[PDB]
Amino acid sequence: GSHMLLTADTVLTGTELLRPGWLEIASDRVVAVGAGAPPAQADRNLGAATVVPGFVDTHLHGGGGGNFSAATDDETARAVALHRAHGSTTLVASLVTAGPEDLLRQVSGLARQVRAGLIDGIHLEGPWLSTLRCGAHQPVLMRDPDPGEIGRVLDAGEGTVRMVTIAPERDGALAAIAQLVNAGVVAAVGHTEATYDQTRAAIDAGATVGTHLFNAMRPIDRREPGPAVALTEDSRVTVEMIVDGVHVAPAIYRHITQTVGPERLSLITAAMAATGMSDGVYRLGPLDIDVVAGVARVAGTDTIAGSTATMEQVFRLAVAHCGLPRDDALSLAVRQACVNPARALGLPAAGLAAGARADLVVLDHDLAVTAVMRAGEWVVT
Amino acid sequence: GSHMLLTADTVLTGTELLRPGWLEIASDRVVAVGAGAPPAQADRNLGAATVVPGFVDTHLHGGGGGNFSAATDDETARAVALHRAHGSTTLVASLVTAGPEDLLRQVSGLARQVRAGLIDGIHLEGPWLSTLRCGAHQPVLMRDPDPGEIGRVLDAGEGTVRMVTIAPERDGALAAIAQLVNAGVVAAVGHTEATYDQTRAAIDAGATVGTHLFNAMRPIDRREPGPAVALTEDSRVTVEMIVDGVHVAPAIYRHITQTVGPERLSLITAAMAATGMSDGVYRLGPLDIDVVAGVARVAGTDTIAGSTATMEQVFRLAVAHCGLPRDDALSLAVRQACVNPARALGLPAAGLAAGARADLVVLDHDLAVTAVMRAGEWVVTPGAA
Ligand SMILES: CC(=O)N[C@@H]1[C@@H](O)[C@H](O)[C@@H](COP(=O)(O)O)O[C@@H]1O
Ligand SMILES: [Cl-]
Ligand SMILES: [Cl-]
Ligand SMILES: [Zn+2]
Ligand SMILES: [Zn+2]
Secondary structure, three states: OOOEEEEEOEEEOOOOEEOOEEEEEEOOEEEEEEEOOOOOOOOEEOOOOEEEEOEEEEEEOEEOOEEHHHOOHHHHHHHHHHHHHOOEEEEEEEEOOOOHHHHHHHHHHHHHHHHHOOOOEEEEEOOOOOHHHOOOOOHHHOOOOOHHHHHHHHHHHOOOEEEEEEOOOOOOHHHHHHHHHHOOOEEEEOOEOOOHHHHHHHHHOOOOEEOOOOOOEOOOOOOOOOHHHHHHHOOOOEEEEEOOOOOOOHHHHHHHHHHHOOOOEEEEOOEOOOOOOOOEEEEEOOEEEEEEOOEEEEOOOOOEOOEOOOHHHHHHHHHHHOOOOHHHHHHHHHHHHHHHHHHHOOOOOOOOOOOOEOOEEEEOOOOOEEEEEEOOEEEEO | OOEEEEEEOEEEOOOOEEOOEEEEEEOOEEEEEEEOOOOOOOOEEOOOOEEEEOEEEEEEOEEOOEEHHHOOHHHHHHHHHHHHHOOEEEEEEEEEOOOHHHHHHHHHHHHHHHHHOOOOOEEEEOOOOEOOOOOOOOHHHOOOOOHHHHHHHHHHHOOOEEEEEEOOOOOOHHHHHHHHHHOOOEEEEOOEOOOHHHHHHHHHOOOOEEOOOOOOEOOOOOOOOOHHHHHHHOOOOEEEEEOOOOOOOHHHHHHHHHHHOOOOEEEEOOOOOOOOOOOEEEEEOOEEEEEEOOEEEEOOOOOEOOOOOOHHHHHHHHHHHOOOOHHHHHHHHHHHHHHHHHHHOOOOOOOOOOOOEOOEEEEOOOOOEEEEEEOOEEEEOOOOO
8 A cells, every 4th residue: 555544442463452543554564553542644443443463373274165285376365365354364374194295296386375475384284293193184194204304395395384293202203303493494293192201302302382282182181291281381382272162172271371371372273174165075185074063073083173263263262261351351362363373483573563564453343353454455445 | 485586597488588587486476587687696596497387288187007087086196296297287187988977976076186286177078079080088988968967067076177078060069069168168179070160160159179189080171171170270269289299290280380370279198097107017997008118008909098198298399390490499389388278278377477376397408307396386396307
């Protein structure tokens, strides 16, 4: 654009709650943001709306019928369009376990769409995972992390692979974590039967993210705490959680938030390709997924295979279920849905502040998305 | 009575860490506490020792060969003498699940020792329980909480029953919790297969304590969190934890401390009658117990017969495993072993402060007890441990 001055009764910047607030947008940047009456006459008076920074979804597999694992322009476009429509202005595309050949093709294909700007990075969830915690993955393809293949895969992405999930109990997992962190890649722990001690070792080797805490993860036990306690204990780790109301009980979300504090939890969707569509049978990598009432299940089991949630939905549920008063709930959920995930992944600092890119979301009273701006242009006007 | 002046390199009062510190004792009361040099020449300089308030053990079954469930002067005296020598200056004696007539006799007999001053209260850990997990005491006598029997048992205690463990899923549990709170008794949640929702209902009905969190309790599951999460979530609840290194992993104790904060965890021993006994085989109530390297087992079996922890041991393990630097660790451990449990049970607020009873413990640099004072007199005088 050129000159936009927005007002709204509430503006959350990432670190403060402005009531009322205003933002001045020039081209694709925020030039200025503040509380009270605006420094000039406003162009857009949003009224009784809440403005938050754009949502930063760092772990999702598709949407609107599109699968990121397809690594085609059409499927990526329809996934990006749906999530962007719901306020996810930054997206890390996740790949499920795959054979070496398909992995290179998928990484190369997605890396092109990063460079094109459709997605902001690649997450490799697999193949270096535990077969005991596979879920919606093909366990046959999981393998020990080999430093030759890791280098080949990172070479193919040309710096666009941002995060790799590792099962810390596989042979060569601790070397692979060091190898990833030397390449500037975030090492995440997930899909693992690791003990407390093995997860603690992975953290000391440089893992800094917990992949959807409590899902595909050994449970907490009084004598063997398991990975979830190692991950919540260490302040260097940002834990992911899927708060769609299906993957973990809301009281678990509340418990972990209590434990790790406001800066150490990231909300994610793990959205699959049926997000935004109708019910039926779908595809995730090389698997068939039956979505019944929006609940994704691997065809023929009881295993939930991913969510059908957008960041707008998990934001709303975080606010409702975090147990804090409304204003504090909004502030917390903005840290979890915008600030913490961008920080954890080395992404452009989320936040509405002078010089930041103008990515923001307008929420109505019920906290539904009414507008979405990305790079200073309305995606949803 | 005259004023005794004590000095030590470090005095923890329950809220402050004084370095150096001093305390003035008159009769059985603390007169004054302060930092720096004493007001006069001290009657005893404890030197390079750390003084803490007396330990408050709110859940234990015996020690030194005595079972509180015996409800005799001889068994209670032996248990009290053992734990007192390791710094527990306040004790709440626990009874396991028992038959209705045996329950009344045990309560009646322990109430007399409350009135005599050997113990400070009674905890009924049973019979209104409902778990078969390891830790179950006598599950064939577990039964629904009948308000008639509760009134009869509370009457028998003449106000000395301070805590009652309730499994929240039994018919009548929520009513029993309301009945206990109205009678001024603490309702604890424990020995239960209750869901998260059923436990949160018990908390809304007035339960304020979790009986040895994670032990004898449904575990945490991602879709059914179980009672431990309801108990850690609610600020009204003080959770018990047995930190002897065996009942819960040290990192679980850190996790829970990190979750609930410094005010909401109590260290307990759940000590059984073999606590503090030398290696050997012993007749303790209805069981032959074999003690090997301080671990008690029923003779002829590999099965561990419960905790043999003293408050001295759990305090030292709490300081070692809480993951804080030493001074912050001592300050947390004093809250968990002294202030939080006394407050949860409505006991005389622990702490070395003007007006408080003179109950304190002297520890060396290894955090071993070297002296114990209770009501202004040395139970264990410095050097005699
Ligand atoms: C793509 C993928 O792997 N998604 C996982 C799924 O595998 C797992 O079954 C589910 C719950 O796992 P849980 O039953 O251990 O919580 O979480 C995620 O949806
Ligand atoms: Cl997932
Ligand atoms: Cl016990
Ligand atoms: Zn995933
Ligand atoms: Zn007990």
